[PDB]
Amino acid sequence: ELGWRNFLADAQLQQLVALALANNRDLRVATLDIDEARALYRIQRAAQDASVGLTHFEIDLFGRVRSLSHAAQEQYLATEEARRSVHISLVAEVANTYLTLLADRALLALAQDTLRSQQDAADMIHRGKQAGAMAQLDEHRADTQVQTARVAAEQYTRQIAQDENALAVLIGGPLPAGVSRAAPLGDRALLAEFPAGLPSTLLERRPDIMAAEHRLIAANAQIGAARAAFFPRITLTGALGVASASLAGLFSGGVAWLFVPQLTLPIFNAGSNQANLDLATVRRDINVAGYEHTIQDAFREVADNLAARATYEREVKAQEAMIRDLAETKRLADMRFRNGVDDYFGVFDAQRQLFAAQQLLVTYKLAGLTSRVTLYKALGGGWVE
């Protein structure tokens, strides 16, 4: 069926996905559960769009069944491509929800550590009484440091609740006790890295390419001829799962890609041989033109998610060096305040920037993980062992 154990490496994460797949609900209900779960924890957190994190074929599926009656939905969803599309969405949505859960716990723990340190900072400032011209200013500042920490902790406790609700919906039942006692996000690896040199033929398993090839078979076209004409044969990834030079070369210069379609095999058994070797005439067939566009969108989608990930990993490293400088700045501020050389504003300003940067680091790490989950989908379901 669908392969995901090579991508989802964490044992607890593997357990959740297996329970979501083993649920006895029908695919129409599974579609309704994924919709409800995303609304609980994902759609409205796009502020920091109902289709966020969905590939082209997922958007196709969810829009098609929404336009249909229940009878039509159950029949549309019985096809092999529709079944694979719902499985891919379900596997990915369980992973992104459990990863988001572990991220929101780290955010809560960070907000609680900040809350405890700032409560002791506010205690130390009030102890050293002084003239109210500036001392009263330091007291209000120290209190609004604690206030921002308390508010952040409350936001993350609520987001943890939403993650656990959506996770229960996605697996169709109560959460196992292993979720309650899972190791913090930190630096441990839950996803496996994409292998180097993934073949583009993996995209044949995309539900939107399967349906496009099915339409051509029913229209009496030869799929082999169509692949030769419109389906690039390149590697998709390079070292450490970055975009391969072949894939980046297809989109060098932007605009429309640089793949050159050529007709060497007749796509249709009918019509004159001259018509079978002219691209313009073959593109007037709706199933050939749709097939050609579906392949360009599939490759473009794969390149876009690889670049998106590279951007997020860049932001993580930038945020870490920023946290490195702010940590030292706050240390040199704490030192000058303890001696009395400078006022407390320097500690206040540095701590407030440090805590904001530490929260951003977690969100940027999660976005990198999320984009790997999305790339697992855009490939048609990861890679073969």
Side-chain angles (χ1 to χ4, degrees), residues 23 28 62 73 169 184 256 307:
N23 200 249
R28 191 180 62 76
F62 282 102
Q73 289 171 32
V169 174

PDB file of all heavy atoms in Angstrom, residues 23 28 62 73 169 184 256 307:
ATOM      1  N   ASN A  23      -8.109   2.609  11.843  1.00  0.00           N
ATOM      2  CA  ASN A  23      -9.464   2.981  12.229  1.00  0.00           C
ATOM      3  C   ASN A  23     -10.467   2.453  11.211  1.00  0.00           C
ATOM      4  O   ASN A  23     -10.221   2.472  10.002  1.00  0.00           O
ATOM      5  CB  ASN A  23      -9.576   4.500  12.358  1.00  0.00           C
ATOM      6  CG  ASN A  23     -10.765   4.927  13.194  1.00  0.00           C
ATOM      7  OD1 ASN A  23     -11.725   5.502  12.682  1.00  0.00           O
ATOM      8  ND2 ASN A  23     -10.711   4.638  14.489  1.00  0.00           N
ATOM      9  N   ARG A  28     -14.837   8.652   3.574  1.00  0.00           N
ATOM     10  CA  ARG A  28     -15.612   9.888   3.645  1.00  0.00           C
ATOM     11  C   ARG A  28     -15.564  10.483   5.047  1.00  0.00           C
ATOM     12  O   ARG A  28     -15.433  11.703   5.208  1.00  0.00           O
ATOM     13  CB  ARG A  28     -17.057   9.636   3.217  1.00  0.00           C
ATOM     14  CG  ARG A  28     -17.861  10.908   3.001  1.00  0.00           C
ATOM     15  CD  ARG A  28     -19.299  10.609   2.584  1.00  0.00           C
ATOM     16  NE  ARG A  28     -20.025   9.872   3.613  1.00  0.00           N
ATOM     17  CZ  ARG A  28     -20.496  10.418   4.732  1.00  0.00           C
ATOM     18  NH1 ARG A  28     -20.311  11.712   4.976  1.00  0.00           N
ATOM     19  NH2 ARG A  28     -21.145   9.669   5.613  1.00  0.00           N
ATOM     20  N   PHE A  62     -10.317  17.252  -1.871  1.00  0.00           N
ATOM     21  CA  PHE A  62     -11.213  17.842  -0.882  1.00  0.00           C
ATOM     22  C   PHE A  62     -12.253  18.751  -1.524  1.00  0.00           C
ATOM     23  O   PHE A  62     -13.390  18.827  -1.044  1.00  0.00           O
ATOM     24  CB  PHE A  62     -10.403  18.604   0.166  1.00  0.00           C
ATOM     25  CG  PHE A  62      -9.749  17.715   1.189  1.00  0.00           C
ATOM     26  CD1 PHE A  62      -8.396  17.414   1.113  1.00  0.00           C
ATOM     27  CD2 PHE A  62     -10.492  17.173   2.223  1.00  0.00           C
ATOM     28  CE1 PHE A  62      -7.796  16.590   2.055  1.00  0.00           C
ATOM     29  CE2 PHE A  62      -9.901  16.349   3.167  1.00  0.00           C
ATOM     30  CZ  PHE A  62      -8.552  16.057   3.083  1.00  0.00           C
ATOM     31  N   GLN A  73     -19.728  10.814  -3.165  1.00  0.00           N
ATOM     32  CA  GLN A  73     -18.452  10.867  -2.452  1.00  0.00           C
ATOM     33  C   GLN A  73     -17.922   9.466  -2.181  1.00  0.00           C
ATOM     34  O   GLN A  73     -16.750   9.171  -2.442  1.00  0.00           O
ATOM     35  CB  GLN A  73     -18.606  11.645  -1.142  1.00  0.00           C
ATOM     36  CG  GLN A  73     -18.793  13.140  -1.321  1.00  0.00           C
ATOM     37  CD  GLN A  73     -19.160  13.844  -0.027  1.00  0.00           C
ATOM     38  OE1 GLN A  73     -18.748  13.432   1.056  1.00  0.00           O
ATOM     39  NE2 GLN A  73     -19.944  14.910  -0.136  1.00  0.00           N
ATOM     40  N   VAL A 169      -8.882  13.297  17.150  1.00  0.00           N
ATOM     41  CA  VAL A 169      -9.755  13.186  15.986  1.00  0.00           C
ATOM     42  C   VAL A 169      -9.059  12.421  14.868  1.00  0.00           C
ATOM     43  O   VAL A 169      -9.671  11.582  14.194  1.00  0.00           O
ATOM     44  CB  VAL A 169     -10.201  14.585  15.517  1.00  0.00           C
ATOM     45  CG1 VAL A 169     -10.989  14.489  14.216  1.00  0.00           C
ATOM     46  CG2 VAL A 169     -11.024  15.271  16.593  1.00  0.00           C
ATOM     47  N   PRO A 184      11.085  15.595  25.197  1.00  0.00           N
ATOM     48  CA  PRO A 184      10.899  16.927  24.613  1.00  0.00           C
ATOM     49  C   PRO A 184      11.470  17.004  23.206  1.00  0.00           C
ATOM     50  O   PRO A 184      12.338  16.221  22.817  1.00  0.00           O
ATOM     51  CB  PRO A 184      11.656  17.849  25.579  1.00  0.00           C
ATOM     52  CG  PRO A 184      12.628  16.952  26.277  1.00  0.00           C
ATOM     53  CD  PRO A 184      11.935  15.631  26.400  1.00  0.00           C
ATOM     54  N   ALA A 256       8.188  29.898 -16.920  1.00  0.00           N
ATOM     55  CA  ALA A 256       7.923  28.518 -17.287  1.00  0.00           C
ATOM     56  C   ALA A 256       9.219  27.715 -17.303  1.00  0.00           C
ATOM     57  O   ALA A 256      10.300  28.239 -17.590  1.00  0.00           O
ATOM     58  CB  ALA A 256       7.244  28.450 -18.651  1.00  0.00           C
ATOM     59  N   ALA A 307      12.799  24.373  -1.664  1.00  0.00           N
ATOM     60  CA  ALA A 307      13.299  25.719  -1.405  1.00  0.00           C
ATOM     61  C   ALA A 307      12.730  26.269  -0.107  1.00  0.00           C
ATOM     62  O   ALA A 307      13.448  26.910   0.668  1.00  0.00           O
ATOM     63  CB  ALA A 307      12.960  26.643  -2.573  1.00  0.00           C
TER      64      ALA A 307
END
